[PDB]
Amino acid sequence: FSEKNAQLLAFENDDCHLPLAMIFTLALAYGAVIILGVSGNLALIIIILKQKEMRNVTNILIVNLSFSDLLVAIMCLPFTFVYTLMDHWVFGEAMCKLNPFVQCVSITVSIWSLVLIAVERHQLIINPRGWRPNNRHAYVGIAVIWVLAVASSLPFLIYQVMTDEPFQNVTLDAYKDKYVCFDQFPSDSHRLSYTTLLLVLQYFGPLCFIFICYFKIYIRLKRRSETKRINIMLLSIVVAFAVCWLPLTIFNTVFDWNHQIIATCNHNLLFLLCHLTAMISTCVNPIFYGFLNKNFQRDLQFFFNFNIFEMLRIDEGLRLKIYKDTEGYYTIGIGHLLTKSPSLNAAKSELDKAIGRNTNGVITKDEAEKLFNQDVDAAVRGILRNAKLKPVYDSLDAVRRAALINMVFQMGETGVAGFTNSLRMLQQKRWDEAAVNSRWYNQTPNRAKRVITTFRTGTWDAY
Numbered sequence: 273f274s275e276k277n278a279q280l281l282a283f284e285n286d287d288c289h290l291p292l293a294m295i296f297t298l299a300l301a302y303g304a305v306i307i308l309g310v311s312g313n314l315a316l317i318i319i320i321l322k323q324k325e326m327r328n329v330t331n332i333l334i335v336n337l338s339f340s341d342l343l344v345a346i347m348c349l350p351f352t353f354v355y356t357l358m359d360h361w362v363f364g365e366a367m368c369k370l371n372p373f374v375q376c377v378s379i380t381v382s383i384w385s386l387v388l389i390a391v392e393r394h395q396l397i398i399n400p401r402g403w404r405p406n407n408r409h410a411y412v413g414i415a416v417i418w419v420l421a422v423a424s425s426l427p428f429l430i431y432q433v434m435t436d437e438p439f440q441n442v443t444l445d446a447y448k449d450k451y452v453c454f455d456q457f458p459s460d461s462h463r464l465s466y467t468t469l470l471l472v473l474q475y476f477g478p479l480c481f482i483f484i485c486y487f488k489i490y491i492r493l494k495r496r497s498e499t500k501r502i503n504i505m506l507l508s509i510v511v512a513f514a515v516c517w518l519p520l521t522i523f524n525t526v527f528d529w530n531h532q533i534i535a536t537c538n539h540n541l542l543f544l545l546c547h548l549t550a551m552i553s554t555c556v557n558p559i560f561y562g563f564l565n566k567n568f569q570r571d572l573q574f575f576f577n578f579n580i581f582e583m584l585r586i587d588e589g590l591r592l593k594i595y596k597d598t599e600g601y602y603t604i605g606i607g608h609l610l611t612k613s614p615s616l617n618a619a620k621s622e623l624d625k626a627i628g629r630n631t632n633g634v635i636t637k638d639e640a641e642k643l644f645n646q647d648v649d650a651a652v653r654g655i656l657r658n659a660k661l662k663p664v665y666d667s668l669d670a671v672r673r674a675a676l677i678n679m680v681f682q683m684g685e686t687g688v689a690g691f692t693n694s695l696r697m698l699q700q701k702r703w704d705e706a707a708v709n710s711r712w713y714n715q716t717p718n719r720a721k722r723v724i725t726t727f728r729t730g731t732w733d734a735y
């Protein structure tokens with residue numbers, strides 16, 4: 273019973289006529305991505321390997337990614353292109369089976385590397401106390417990724433067939449003896465289950481996890497090492513991969529679910545445009561690393577012109593031992609007042625209660641950060657209970673919210689609400705009119721201007 277022959281795609285729009293101009297344009301485009309892919313990745317592989325850095329996890333995974341993109345450029349990319357133009361497979365059955373297998377292996381190898389890099393960067397910012405990413409851990413990761421990528425791509429090597437059966441329906445009576453390189457899965461269910469597996473496990477799934485990682489990193493930094501340029505580059509590499517693959521993912525998925533569609537001409541041109549777009553991702557990564565260099569950027573910008581914790585550690589400082597403030601009251605950490613009493617034993621008692629240990633007038637930076645976390649949490653709940661503070665805070669962004677929290681750390685919940693004039697203008701987004709509008713600038717001019725600039729601009733110019 274030929275149930276396998278019914279799992280082969282049907283094509284019937286022999287009237288495929290593209291102007292030589294468009295074909296030549298595609299040959300130059302594919303030619304450009306083939307050279308940029310082979311040249312850019314080889315350069316990236318050699319540059320990372322020759323630059324010996326004792327502990328670099330991210331770049332080892334970028335070599336992994338660029339080596340798989342180097343494989344596609346040699347083994348897949350030229351073969352897939354001429355095959356679509358000629359409209360018959362002139363290579364071996366080996367190349368026929370290798371073409372979708374090697375491409376599928378490479379998609380999984382690239383995205384699961386990007387998954388590990390997102391984890392690596394998540395562990396460096398969210399949990400720096402653990403600092404788990406090591407080179408040995410990456411070497412196991414790459415070996416797991418390749419072994420699993422191959423195993424999960426084998427149905428392409430197994431069921432992709434070099435066949436001439438689809439040629440029976442399109443006349444072909446009777447001179448050509450031509451072959452097409454088509455997938456021939458065991459059933460409709462086998463195809464749909466496997467294609468869904470690939471879509472969920474290699475595209476929608478991994479990208480969801482990565483975007484959650486970079487968003488958890490984004491939100492942490494706003495509440496809270498010049499590797500910011502790196503994190504923006506790595507994010508723009510995932511966005512690049514996802515955006516280049518999206519049209520091909522949509523195209524292929526439509527054909528996986530509606531396998532009874534007669535593949536026309538228009539579908540051949542549509543596939544080429546989609547495929548070429550997906551091939552752009554195999555050469556963008558080295559162009560990101562090249563444009564990362566600070567000197568080259570300085571040349572570029574000259575030719576073409578185109579956080580609460582850190583804010584308060586500057587404005588109030590960080591102390592691990594009990595000290596007297598400007599008023600003489602016993603403080604600790606980031607402006608944390610213990611008592612307004614003259615007693616030192618009372619302060620040490622209040623400190624021992626807050627921490628839950630016999631501190632003996634001394635704490636660690638972790639106990640100092642937690643005490644500050646407790647302070648800002650108590651400061652934010654007080655802002656919400658206040659009728660003048662709750663509406664202005666809600667309208668304010670994370671940068672200007674940090675400046676309003678900085679203010680409550682200096683005066684208090686009642687002191688800040690005393691600025692009836694300025695609070696109204698900050699609520700109405702009139703920042704410059706509010707910045708010009710107290711004894712606060714008279715007592716400390718340096719600190720007051722540092723927070724006024726953040727209320728006016730909405731960035732960290734002063735810090």
Ligand SMILES: CCC(=O)NCCNC(=O)/N=C(/N)NCCC[C@@H](NC(=O)C(c1ccccc1)c1ccccc1)C(=O)NCc1ccc(O)cc1
Pocket residue numbers: 281371372373375376379455467468470471474475517520521522523524525527528535539540543
């Ligand atoms: C695409 C990204 C993704 O993550 N997709 C998850 C879900 N589905 C999925 O991957 N499906 C398939 N069928 N992969 C092999 C595509 C081979 C080929 N496409 C076709 O012949 C399709 C076709 C149809 C009409 C005209 C021209 C081309 C076609 C699609 C479906 C059935 C039959 C023919 C092609 O795009 N080759 C490059 C390639 C190879 C492996 C791979 O995993 C991704 C990309």
